């Protein structure tokens, strides 16, 4: 049915002024959609920042406010702070009802970027006896936090059977993630080669095997 | 849709005066929802209060459902204007006057669910005798009513029940719109009476109100022992200059008539 | 300060139905309606419903009809929501969400709950399955397959080798969790130097061991 | 819109020679309502400071049957609350200080009703309080003091004072 | 305490009509509407009627509509019903059930009379026709037909008349049947 | 039209939980049915227990209370008593009137349990004679009260002895043409049947 | 009755009206009710007041003669309420 | 049945502006009942009181039967709106 559509993730330095947006499927962001903003902060830190007519949560901080630039809901955090990289959904009210936003991951920037180190393992001899195939893609060292991960076999992309997990900070503040594919047994005799390929900040990391 | 749904149902042969069917030939099982929404003006003279409140009645018309089922029509359609529907012919035994409020448009909700289960909800305006006993009047509580039954329906044809879940609700600026009075305890009863014209089903709420204090303190008990601490300071003077003491007296006693009247 | 503390963590088989609860502080309960979003691992966040805790009245989202059924116990402040007929797809985490208006519907969210973890599985109790993951820098890792109940413990060489190692969140692949756990050293260091991965997975008593070998 | 007062008591359209009503229909199908209306709306009062008081009073707005799926008020963008010029010039007791224009939607037992809120606030005049309660018993007061300069020995003439000053005060509190 | 005494038993003939009463006490009388309840041997307990004291409103049973008429006369606190055109049908006994509540129909019952036990009959005194019945320890019968183990059973109603046996195990066996009303004793010999 | 059923008869100790059910012919017991329970002692002594919406009578025990178990009309005794023992009789009403049920005979036990001693008479000759046979099966001994017999028949209303065990008598009558059998009891328990 | 704090409905009657009117001779009911003035209130607030007011009036023929002033003030102040109470 | 009765007795030639026929000609009598709910409002200056009770009439109208001797047909029949009554 009705759909919101936000930015996958967006970048901005300490200090400066960025914007997210919330687009409504079904036409321009209308007063009587009331569009909602909710932040997440990492462990599941949810608290709301706009909402309503033009009302906002208690405390939340000035730099923080909201528009309806072109015909969509706008977030604007002018003198963006270390503390406010987080996830942002935004949620839109039609007729009797919420529907949130895929979130925008907002980084504040308090490293430099770093590409991520994929490594792509074949599925070990050992549980092929189980007559299954797992094909592990360990992603890791890579900042912002945010990577697509496609899986393509033979040429042809992958539709079915993969699992990406979320990127999650590791100890030297940057993030890490891993994918994986499920095969049966038969399959991996069946297809020769297979290759796990990750987008991060535009450039992309292909790692391949036969 | 909707004003197809409302077609479909008159274009038959559907008589709003007659009494909705029932599967064992029973009576017509009316749940009623009672908000009030104001308790003001009660008198304790003519012995009555005025209370502002929203009826809901809900009932089961077979001949109304559209969906049954449904799952794939709306859930209830609004029943817009220039469509009879009988509707339980209730009244407010003790009420002395009544109101119904259509300003701009009438005050009133009917829904019909699929299920031919019928909401009716309209906002009124009541002003209930209520039999007030002024034993301990400074220090008393009252407990006032509003009785709903059918007028010309029976117990054959018609019966009152309280919605299961908070059959009496209260908006939440009530008690501030009551200065003088705190409701503490609310009821709801049945009343159902046997009449010379037969048995009537009868619902009964019941509010029950303390009378605020602090007023009379302030108004009655704290300026008469202020009037009889004055009448002592007469004890003090000399027996000689009786004058003053009589002054006292007498104004003190003379003022107490007055505060009472 | 307002707070929301939500039950906790909750496991049950599909069919069955279970309450969780959301035990409001810090403010007149019965002023603000409370709100419950479901964030599940599949898709996003969902509005499941809203109720007036001084009204006791309620509005759902039609996919939630019947689903979930909210409630409010006024003596004791806190806002308790029923699931019905439980299934894999109701595997999730569950938020309580304030309105921002006093005594009033203003339509924006003030504070939430920690959350509540949901996990629908009729699943038993099984140990981990561990599998080696071998291919300047080389990397080794290990793949624990078809456990449940969570959680696991990995460590390398039984604790040695603590430098760059990385253990993943966990994914529901077969209705049984599944993590794998990577490391990075040196190459003359393997096959050269032995190494291997300990698994430990508490909810069976399974701490098995498995070599990296090329 | 079959818009009603939740806060009405009594109610009154104007119908004389002819109803009180304006409506408009735009070629692009927008329309214009207007209507006079009188009404007796409730507005609980707080005296705790009575004499130098203020109150908030308020007319609420919103739809009876249909939901917030049907019907949405909204108020005008710009100058949703407009006074008329002789309003403050038939309101003598009081001074129209300060008006506010708000949403009050709320969450009933039968669904989610849109409604609107317009608060006006009502400074009390104080001048009447000023010479029918503070300075008459400041007079009061002060003559309840001229006996003191009495001769101690006339005590007939100090009690009526005294007790005189009181009663009266306790007259005008009444 | 409250209390509601009856009139006495009744032997009427068919085609008569006749009152019986219910005298309350205890309570505030025109407070509390009055059920009327009949017990027969030959079905179970039926709802006759009620009468509210105060209103001297009615409402009957469609069984009992013209069968039964309820009054009350409030000066003496009692409720009456009567019975028309009694049968053989109408010999039962009736009940009189006070409602619950006060000065409103709570429909619930508090308490109920003794009774009063009407017989609507057409039959003259009949001699009892005694007929002997017979098969360690062997048990006779002793059959009374129309009118150490001393069994006695009770007495049935077969055809507008009654009919008992009697056992009686032991290890010359008579039986003696004597009627008072009728003035006939008989002997019946138990043989083999 | 409308029936009221109840068990025709329960068991139970003193100091346990017994349930009498009230079910009604046309649908589920609701609670425009006002289902009303009524007590009789021995000598027809009737009194109110339970009734009207959720009320009861004055006095009533309370131990006894009411509900709706399934889609008919319960009467729980929580902690039945010795006195407790007698005839129960619900009513459901209708529309515009009442209808009571057959009633349930509850016993509380006091006596250990006995098997009804049976004894079928066939007719006489001087009945054959009278052109009408009658046939008598006398039951003695047994407890508690409560016996059913199964063969025009007429089966007296148990009362108890000199040793307090119940007993009663059978009637099933023919003609003398008719003429030219067995009698069963079944006791909470075993069938006693004799040809 | 319970709604009717300050009477008393002692006696009902049911009458015919029925009149000869100058357009004919209209059938005509009369329902009549007798309301008797309930009396603790004027016992309370009229007769009770006043026999304490003449009382007072009394207690001034305790006070020597010559103080009038006493006597006076007594005799005018009971009186003037008087008044009042009867207004 | 109900609306099937009403029916009958409205599908004829009735009026209901004619008073109702009698046997010898004689008038319509009009039995009436009367309900006292409340009295109140006792006015002594305006010399008048308010009460509000339920009246009850009730007078033979031959054209509206439709069971006379009924005893198969129900007693009486609510009368539905739309339906007019001489009264
Ligand atoms: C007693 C009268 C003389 C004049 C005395 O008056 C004063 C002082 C001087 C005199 C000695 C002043 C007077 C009070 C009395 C004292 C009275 C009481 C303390 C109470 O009453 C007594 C007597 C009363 O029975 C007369 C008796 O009730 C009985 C008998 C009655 O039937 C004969 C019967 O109906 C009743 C049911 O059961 C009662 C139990 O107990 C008290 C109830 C009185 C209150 C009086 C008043 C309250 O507000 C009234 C009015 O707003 C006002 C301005 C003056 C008051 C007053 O008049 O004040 C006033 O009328 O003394
Ligand atoms: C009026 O103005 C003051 C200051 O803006 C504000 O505090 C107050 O709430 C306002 N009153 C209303 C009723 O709008
Ligand atoms: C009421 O009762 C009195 C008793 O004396 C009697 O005189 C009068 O006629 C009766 N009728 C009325 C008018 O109420
Ligand atoms: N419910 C009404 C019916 C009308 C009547 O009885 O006359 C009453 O009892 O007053
Ligand atoms: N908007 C109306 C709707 C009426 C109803 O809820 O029954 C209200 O104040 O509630």
């Given at each position: 049915?009705?759909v ?13 002024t960025?914007?997210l ?33 033009n ?9 923080f406010?909201?528009?309806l ?13 270390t503390?406010?990289?987080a ?9 009797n009802?919420?529907?949130?936003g ?5 980084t ?9 180190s ?6 070990s ?12 893609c ?9 990577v ?8 042809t ?26 095969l ?23 790692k391949?095997?036969? | 849709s909707?004003?197809?749904?409302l077609?479909?149902?008159?274009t ?63 859930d209830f ?16 035994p ?12 009438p005050?009133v ?13 309209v906002?009124?305006?009541?002003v ?42 209260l908006?939440?600026?009530l008690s ?18 046997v ?12 509010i029950?109100?303390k ?25 003090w003077?000399?027996?000689?200059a ?18 009472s009247? | ?13 599909p ?25 599940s ?10 109720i ?16 979930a ?10 806002a ?7 299934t ?9 969400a304030?309105?921002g ?29 561990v ?7 080389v990397t ?13 413990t990995?460590?390398?060489?039984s ?9 993943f ?8 969790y599944?993590?794998?756990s ?12 032995t190494?291997?991965?300990?698994v ?15």
């Amino acid at each position: 049915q009705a759909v919101v559509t936000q930015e996958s993730a967006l970048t901005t330095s300490p200090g400066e002024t960025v914007t997210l947006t919330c687009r409504s499927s079904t036409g321009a962001v209308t007063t009587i959609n009331f569009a909602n903003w909710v932040q997440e902060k990492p462990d599941h830190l949810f608290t709301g920042l706009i909402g309503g007519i033009n009302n906002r949560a208690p405390g939340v901080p000035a730099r923080f406010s909201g528009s309806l630039i072109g015909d969509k809901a706008a977030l604007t955090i002018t003198g963006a702070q270390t503390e406010d990289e987080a996830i942002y959904f935004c949620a839109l009210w039609y007729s009797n009802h919420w529907v949130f936003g895929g979130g925008t991951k907002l980084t504040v920037l308090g490293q430099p970027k770093s590409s991520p180190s994929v490594t792509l393992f074949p599925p070990s001899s050992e549980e092929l006896e189980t007559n299954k195939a797992t094909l592990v893609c360990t992603i890791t060292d890579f900042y912002p936090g945010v990577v697509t991960v496609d899986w393509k076999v033979d040429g042809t992309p992958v539709t079915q059977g993969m699992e990406t997990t979320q990127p999650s900070k590791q100890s030297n503040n940057k993030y890490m993630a891993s994918s994986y594919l499920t095969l049966t047994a038969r399959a991996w005799e069946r297809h020769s080669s297979y290759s796990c390929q990750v987008t991060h900040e535009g450039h992309t990391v292909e790692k391949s095997l036969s | 849709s909707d004003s197809k749904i409302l077609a479909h149902l008159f274009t038959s042969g559907y008589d709003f005066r007659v009494r909705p069917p029932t599967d064992n030939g029973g009576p017509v099982v009316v749940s009623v929802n009672m908000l009030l929404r104001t308790i003001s003006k009660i008198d304790v003279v003519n012995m009555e209060y005025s209370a502002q409140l929203t009826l809901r009645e809900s009932w089961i018309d077979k001949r109304l459902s559209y969906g049954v089922k449904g799952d794939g029509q709306p859930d209830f359609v609004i029943l817009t204007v220039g469509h009879q529907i009988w509707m339980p012919d209730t009244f407010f035994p003790n009420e002395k006057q009544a109101y119904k409020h259509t300003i701009d448009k009438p005050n009133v909700l009917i829904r019909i669910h699929n299920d031919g289960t019928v909401l009716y909800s309209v906002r009124i305006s009541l002003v209930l005798s209520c039999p007030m006993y002024l034993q301990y009047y400074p220090m008393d509580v009252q407990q006032c009513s509003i009785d709903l039954a059918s007028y010309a329906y029976t117990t054959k044809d018609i019966e009152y029940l309280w919605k299961e879940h908070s059959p009496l609700q209260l908006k939440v600026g009530l008690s501030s719109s009551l200065p003088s009075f705190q409701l503490t305890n609310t009821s709801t009863t049945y009343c159902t009476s046997v009449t010379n014209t037969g048995i009537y089903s009868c619902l009964r709420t019941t509010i029950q109100l303390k009378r605020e204090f602090s007023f009379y303190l302030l108004q009655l008990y704290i300026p008469s022992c202020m009037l009889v601490i004055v009448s002592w300071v007469s004890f003090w003077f000399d027996r000689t200059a009786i004058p003053a003491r009589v002054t006292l007296g007498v104004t003190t006693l003379l003022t107490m008539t007055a505060q009472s009247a | 300060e307002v707070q929301l503390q939500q039950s906790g963590p909750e496991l049950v088989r599909p069919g069955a139905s279970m309450k969780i609860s959301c035990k409001a502080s810090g403010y007149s309960f019965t002023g603000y309606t409370m709100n419950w979003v479901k964030q599940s691992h599949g898709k996003n966040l969902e509005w499941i419903g809203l109720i007036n805790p001084y009204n006791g009245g309620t509005s759902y989202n039609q996919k939630f009809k019947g689903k979930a059924t909210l409630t409010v116990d006024k003596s004791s402040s806190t806002a308790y929501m029923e699931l019905l007929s439980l299934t894999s797809e109701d595997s999730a985490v569950y938020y309580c969400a304030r309105d921002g208006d006093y005594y009033r519907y203003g339509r924006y969210f003030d504070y939430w709950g920690q959350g509540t973890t949901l996990t629908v599985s009729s699943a038993k109790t099984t140990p981990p399955s561990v599998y080696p993951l071998a291919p300047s820098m080389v990397t080794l890792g290990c793949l624990v397959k078809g456990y449940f109940p969570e959680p696991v413990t990995v460590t390398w060489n039984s604790g040695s080798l603590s430098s760059g190692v990385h253990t993943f969140p966990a994914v529901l692949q077969s209705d049984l969790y599944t993590l794998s756990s990577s490391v990075t050293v040196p190459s003359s260091t393997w096959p050269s130097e032995t190494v291997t991965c300990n698994v430990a997975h508490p909810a069976s008593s399974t701490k098995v061991d498995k070599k990296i070998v090329p």
